[PDB]
Scaffold this motif. Structure first.
Motif, PDB file in Angstrom:
ATOM      1  N   UNK A 166      61.210  22.103  31.607  1.00 48.85           N
ATOM      2  CA  UNK A 166      60.345  21.426  30.378  1.00 48.85           C
ATOM      3  C   UNK A 166      58.758  21.749  30.770  1.00 48.85           C
ATOM      4  N   UNK A 167      57.966  21.221  29.590  1.00 50.31           N
ATOM      5  CA  UNK A 167      56.695  21.889  29.870  1.00 50.31           C
ATOM      6  C   UNK A 167      55.988  21.533  31.207  1.00 50.31           C
ATOM      7  N   UNK A 168      56.124  20.456  31.735  1.00 52.27           N
ATOM      8  CA  UNK A 168      55.308  20.422  33.148  1.00 52.27           C
ATOM      9  C   UNK A 168      55.791  21.403  34.095  1.00 52.27           C
ATOM     10  N   UNK A 169      57.179  21.564  34.200  1.00 48.58           N
ATOM     11  CA  UNK A 169      57.616  22.789  35.181  1.00 48.58           C
ATOM     12  C   UNK A 169      57.174  23.864  34.864  1.00 48.58           C
ATOM     13  N   UNK A 170      57.261  24.363  33.644  1.00 48.57           N
ATOM     14  CA  UNK A 170      56.716  25.894  33.275  1.00 48.57           C
ATOM     15  C   UNK A 170      55.025  26.005  33.366  1.00 48.57           C
ATOM     16  N   UNK A 171      54.364  24.755  33.423  1.00 48.73           N
ATOM     17  CA  UNK A 171      53.056  24.828  33.511  1.00 48.73           C
ATOM     18  C   UNK A 171      52.718  25.097  35.253  1.00 48.73           C
ATOM     19  N   UNK A 172      53.502  24.568  35.984  1.00 45.24           N
ATOM     20  CA  UNK A 172      53.552  24.852  37.296  1.00 45.24           C
ATOM     21  C   UNK A 172      53.602  26.245  37.723  1.00 45.24           C
ATOM     22  N   UNK A 173      54.605  26.765  37.065  1.00 48.47           N
ATOM     23  CA  UNK A 173      54.765  28.337  37.006  1.00 48.47           C
ATOM     24  C   UNK A 173      53.466  29.037  36.526  1.00 48.47           C
ATOM     25  N   UNK A 174      52.815  28.600  35.518  1.00 51.04           N
ATOM     26  CA  UNK A 174      51.712  29.090  35.032  1.00 51.04           C
ATOM     27  C   UNK A 174      50.428  29.032  35.870  1.00 51.04           C
ATOM     28  N   UNK A 175      50.458  27.492  36.607  1.00 51.51           N
ATOM     29  CA  UNK A 175      49.451  27.511  37.556  1.00 51.51           C
ATOM     30  C   UNK A 175      49.563  28.494  38.914  1.00 51.51           C
ATOM     31  N   UNK A 176      50.759  28.476  39.194  1.00 51.90           N
ATOM     32  CA  UNK A 176      51.005  29.758  40.259  1.00 51.90           C
ATOM     33  C   UNK A 176      50.590  31.086  39.889  1.00 51.90           C
ATOM     34  N   UNK A 177      50.895  31.458  38.665  1.00 51.53           N
ATOM     35  CA  UNK A 177      50.263  32.848  38.076  1.00 51.53           C
ATOM     36  C   UNK A 177      48.790  32.780  38.297  1.00 51.53           C
ATOM     37  N   UNK A 178      48.048  31.767  37.515  1.00 45.04           N
ATOM     38  CA  UNK A 178      46.559  31.702  37.699  1.00 45.04           C
ATOM     39  C   UNK A 178      46.104  31.727  38.972  1.00 45.04           C
ATOM     40  N   UNK A 179      46.848  31.130  40.066  1.00 45.53           N
ATOM     41  CA  UNK A 179      46.218  31.140  41.472  1.00 45.53           C
ATOM     42  C   UNK A 179      46.283  32.646  42.001  1.00 45.53           C
ATOM     43  N   UNK A 180      47.477  33.034  41.624  1.00 46.20           N
ATOM     44  CA  UNK A 180      47.417  34.590  42.121  1.00 46.20           C
ATOM     45  C   UNK A 180      46.652  35.566  41.454  1.00 46.20           C
ATOM     46  N   UNK A 181      46.109  35.455  40.129  1.00 44.38           N
ATOM     47  CA  UNK A 181      45.318  36.229  39.448  1.00 44.38           C
ATOM     48  C   UNK A 181      43.822  35.764  40.206  1.00 44.38           C
ATOM     49  N   UNK A 182      43.543  34.902  40.662  1.00 42.21           N
ATOM     50  CA  UNK A 182      42.363  34.605  41.352  1.00 42.21           C
ATOM     51  C   UNK A 182      42.423  34.683  42.641  1.00 42.21           C
ATOM     52  N   UNK A 183      43.581  35.621  43.545  1.00 41.60           N
ATOM     53  CA  UNK A 183      43.474  35.481  44.852  1.00 41.60           C
ATOM     54  C   UNK A 183      42.798  36.917  45.273  1.00 41.60           C
ATOM     55  N   UNK A 184      42.789  37.100  46.515  1.00 43.25           N
ATOM     56  CA  UNK A 184      42.289  38.100  47.197  1.00 43.25           C
ATOM     57  C   UNK A 184      43.030  39.301  46.928  1.00 43.25           C
ATOM     58  N   UNK A 185      44.539  39.189  46.902  1.00 46.73           N
ATOM     59  CA  UNK A 185      45.505  40.373  46.478  1.00 46.73           C
ATOM     60  C   UNK A 185      44.737  41.008  45.453  1.00 46.73           C
ATOM     61  N   UNK A 186      44.294  40.612  44.264  1.00 48.14           N
ATOM     62  CA  UNK A 186      44.064  41.070  42.881  1.00 48.14           C
ATOM     63  C   UNK A 186      42.661  41.453  42.983  1.00 48.14           C
ATOM     64  N   UNK A 187      41.655  41.126  43.743  1.00 48.53           N
ATOM     65  CA  UNK A 187      40.274  41.003  43.756  1.00 48.53           C
ATOM     66  C   UNK A 187      39.614  42.276  43.036  1.00 48.53           C
ATOM     67  N   UNK A 188      40.198  43.331  43.609  1.00 49.04           N
ATOM     68  CA  UNK A 188      39.635  44.661  43.217  1.00 49.04           C
ATOM     69  C   UNK A 188      39.452  45.031  41.723  1.00 49.04           C
ATOM     70  N   UNK A 189      40.523  44.436  40.948  1.00 41.78           N
ATOM     71  CA  UNK A 189      40.487  44.451  39.497  1.00 41.78           C
ATOM     72  C   UNK A 189      40.389  43.200  38.829  1.00 41.78           C
ATOM     73  N   UNK A 190      40.485  42.060  39.400  1.00 43.65           N
ATOM     74  CA  UNK A 190      40.364  40.816  38.705  1.00 43.65           C
ATOM     75  C   UNK A 190      39.041  40.092  38.566  1.00 43.65           C
ATOM     76  N   UNK A 191      37.801  40.759  39.502  1.00 43.38           N
ATOM     77  CA  UNK A 191      36.623  40.147  39.717  1.00 43.38           C
ATOM     78  C   UNK A 191      35.924  39.995  38.325  1.00 43.38           C
ATOM     79  N   UNK A 192      36.126  41.081  37.209  1.00 47.45           N
ATOM     80  CA  UNK A 192      35.276  40.954  35.957  1.00 47.45           C
ATOM     81  C   UNK A 192      35.619  39.553  35.112  1.00 47.45           C
ATOM     82  N   UNK A 193      36.910  39.138  35.357  1.00 48.10           N
ATOM     83  CA  UNK A 193      37.427  38.053  34.592  1.00 48.10           C
ATOM     84  C   UNK A 193      37.407  36.572  35.414  1.00 48.10           C
TER      85      UNK A 193
END
Ligand SMILES: O=c1cc(N2CCOCC2)oc2c(-c3ccc4c(c3)OCCO4)cccc12
Ligand code: NA
Length: 111
Positions: free
Chosen positions: A1-28
């Protein structure tokens, strides 16, 4: 359902903001400061600015009702970059790399 799918979205968002991707994510990370960057036409060309801090605030406030609403905002942020800049600009190269991270993990969303 929407709440479970939104947990996955929150996980994606956390990953996009993480040090792992900082070399190319910082502009955003934060809204484009058009005046500070000298981009005095940015708000004439980009009608709907978006960035990861705004997505995060919306997620935290339960503004997103479903995963499709979240994905539309993330994609809007990348599209703004593709719209404003020549396609060979380094900021576009960064957008493309971060969008690959996003799209491949969004494709792993549970039903
Ligand atoms: O669509 C964009 C367009 C530009 N431009 C600036 C660079 O040249 C091209 C025009 O920047 C964006 C940035 C950005 C933010 C902070 C910066 C930066 C870039 O660059 C170094 C200084 O801190 C972030 C997201 C989208 C864009
Ligand atoms: Na979409």
């Amino acid at each position: 359902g929407p709440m479970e799918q939104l947990k996955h979205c929150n996980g994606i968002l956390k990953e996009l903001l993480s040090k792992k991707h900082a070399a190319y994510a910082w502009p955003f990370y934060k809204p484009v400061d058009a005046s500070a960057l000298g981009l005095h036409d940015y708000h004439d060309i980009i009608k709907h600015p978006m960035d990861l801090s705004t997505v995060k605030r919306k997620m935290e406030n339960r503004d997103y009702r479903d995963a499709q609403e979240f994905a539309a905002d993330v994609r809007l942020m990348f599209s703004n970059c593709y719209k404003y800049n020549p396609p060979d600009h380094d900021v576009v190269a960064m957008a493309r790399k971060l969008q690959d991270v996003f799209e491949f993990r969004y494709a792993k969303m549970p039903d």
